[PDB]
């Protein structure tokens, strides 16, 4: 029943996120002024969001119609789980790295420009993706294909006992929501405070200098970033935590879980649809580079 409405809701999200992430990636990858500085974090974030869109959206819309069979073998099920988990973790850690480097850039302006190095950028990006792939392993370890006996019908699922699945999901949800959530919130709050406090020896109000609307807009954008991350990634972890808690199902519990899963998927893919916008497009520098690449072609 969810197939048609959910596909209808996803198609706008899918097209928006795909075009946004591809545009961001192309602008960063072509323009020299993006290649040189540490736009690698935003490049990785765009790649990760595009990959989560590609791997979830079409596969999920397919599986919600033909939920009964599964399309691939055990290695396909391992690759699906590993790729999806690693790109989700990579997106989360790219967001966290962007937040940390912005905190350094704002509270330690000199440290940032002295320390900024392409080698350092790629090294941190490698740590990010390495940890993402490493943490993707347990989910891939417990997952597998399952069959229905007494007659095709096969489906990917957690085969190892849910007892350990609950621990795995709780630990991953802690490390990749609660830790990065608090980190990002605290860092952007400190950045907002640093922008708030006044350099002037004597207070003034209503002055026409750009600093005032600039700092107000920056605080608003930081609040948007933190709230987008929290609201988008809370449903994602809620879905898996819910599924891991239930030992035996029933019609009403299954229906409520299906509602939760649909809404959480909407939020989760809206995450990848929105991230490129708020992180690149709403910035004047990216707009300038985008206009430049437009003009050159």
Partner 1 sequence: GRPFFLFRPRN
Partner 2 sequence: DQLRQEAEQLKNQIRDARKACADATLSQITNNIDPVGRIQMRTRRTLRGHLAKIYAMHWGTDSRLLVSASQDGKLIIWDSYTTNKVHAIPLRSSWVMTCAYAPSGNYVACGGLDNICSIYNLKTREGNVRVSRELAGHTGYLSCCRFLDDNQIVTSSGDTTCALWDIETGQQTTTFTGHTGDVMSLSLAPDTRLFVSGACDASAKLWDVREGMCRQTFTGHESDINAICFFPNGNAFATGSDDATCRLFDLRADQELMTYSHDNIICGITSVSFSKSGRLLLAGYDDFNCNVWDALKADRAGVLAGHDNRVSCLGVTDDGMAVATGSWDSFLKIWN
Partner 3 sequence: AEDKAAVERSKMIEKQLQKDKQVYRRTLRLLLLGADNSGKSTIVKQMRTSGIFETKFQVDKVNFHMFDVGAQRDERRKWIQCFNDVTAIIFVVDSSDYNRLQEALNDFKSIWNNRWLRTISVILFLNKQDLLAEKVLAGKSKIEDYFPEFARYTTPEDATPEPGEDPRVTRAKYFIRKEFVDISTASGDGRHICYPHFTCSVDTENARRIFNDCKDIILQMNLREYNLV
Give contact residues for partner 1 (rule: CB under 8 A).
1, 56, 60, 63-64, 67, 81, 84-85, 139, 143, 155-157, 236, 239-240, 242-244, 249-251, 254-255, 257-258, 261-262, 265, 268
Binding mask 32-71 for partner 2 (x = CB under 8 A): xx--------------------------------------
Q: Are 257 and 243 in contact (CB under 8 A)?
A: yes
Q: Running DSSP on this structure, what letter comes out for residue 205? A: -
To partner 1, the closest distance from the beta carbon of 175 in angstroms equals 16
To partner 1, the closest distance from the beta carbon of 108 in angstroms equals 38
**How far is it, in rounded angstroms, from Cα 13 to Cα 154?**
29
Query: Residue from 200, 209, 295, 296 that binds partner 2 (CB under 8 A)?
Result: 296
**Tokens encoding 270:** 């809206």
Q: Which of residues 15-34 bind partner 2 (CB under 8 A)?
A: 32-33
Number of residues lying near partner 2 (CB under 8 A): 3
148 contributes a contact to partner 3 by CB under 8 A: no
To partner 2, the closest distance from the beta carbon of 289 in angstroms equals 12
Q: Are 31 and 289 in contact (CB under 8 A)?
A: yes
Residue number, 32 or 250, with CB nearest to partner 3: 32
295 contributes a contact to partner 2 by CB under 8 A: no
186 contributes a contact to partner 3 by CB under 8 A: no
Would you list the DSSP string of 48-104? HHHHHHHHHHHHHHHHHHS-SS-SS-HHHHHHHHHHHHHHHHHHHHHHHHHHHHHHH
Closest CA to 184 of 92, 61, 247, 292: 92
Place of tokens 């350094």: 104
**How far is it, in rounded angstroms, from Cα 170 to Cα 137?**
15
**Tokens encoding 101:** 């480097």
What element of type H or E holds 248?
Answer: none
4 contributes a contact to partner 2 by CB under 8 A: no
Q: What residues line the site for partner 3 (CB under 8 A)? A: 37, 42, 98, 101-102, 105-106, 109-110, 112-114, 116, 199, 201-204, 208-210, 214, 217-218, 221-222, 279-280, 282-286
Q: What residues line the site for partner 2 (CB under 8 A)? A: 32-33, 296
């Amino acid at each position: 029943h969810f197939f048609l409405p959910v596909s209808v809701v996803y198609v706008p999200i899918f097209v928006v996120g795909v075009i946004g992430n591809v545009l961001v990636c192309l602008v960063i990858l072509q323009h020299q002024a993006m290649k040189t500085p540490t736009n690698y974090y935003l490049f990785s974030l765009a790649v990760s969001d595009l990959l989560v869109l590609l791997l979830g959206m079409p596969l999920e819309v397919y599986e919600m119609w033909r939920n009964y069979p599964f399309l691939f073998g055990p290695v396909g099920c391992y690759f699906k789980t590993a790729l999806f988990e690693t790109v989700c973790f990579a997106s989360i850690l790219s967001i966290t790295t962007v937040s940390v480097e912005r905190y350094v850039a704002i509270l330690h302006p000199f440290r940032a420009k002295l320390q900024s190095t392409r080698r350092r950028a790629l090294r941190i990006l490698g740590i990010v993706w390495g940890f993402s792939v490493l943490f993707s392993l347990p989910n891939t370890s417990i997952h597998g294909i399952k069959f229905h006996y007494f007659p095709g019908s096969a489906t990917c699922t957690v085969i190892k006992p849910m007892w350990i699945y609950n621990f795995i999901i709780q630990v991953t949800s802690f490390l990749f929501y609660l830790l990065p959530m608090t980190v990002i919130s605290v860092l952007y709050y400190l950045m907002a405070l640093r922008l708030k406090k006044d350099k002037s020896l004597e207070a003034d109000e209503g002055n026409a200098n750009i600093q005032r609307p600039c700092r107000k807009s920056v605080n608003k954008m930081l609040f948007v970033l933190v709230l987008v991350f929290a609201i988008c990634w809370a449903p994602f972890h809620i879905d898996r935590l819910f599924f891991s808690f239930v030992e035996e199902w029933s019609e009403s519990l299954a229906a409520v879980f299906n509602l939760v899963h649909v809404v959480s998927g909407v939020f989760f893919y809206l995450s990848s649809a929105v991230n490129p916008i708020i992180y690149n497009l709403l910035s004047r520098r990216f707009q300038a580079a985008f206009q430049n690449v437009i003009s050159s072609f």
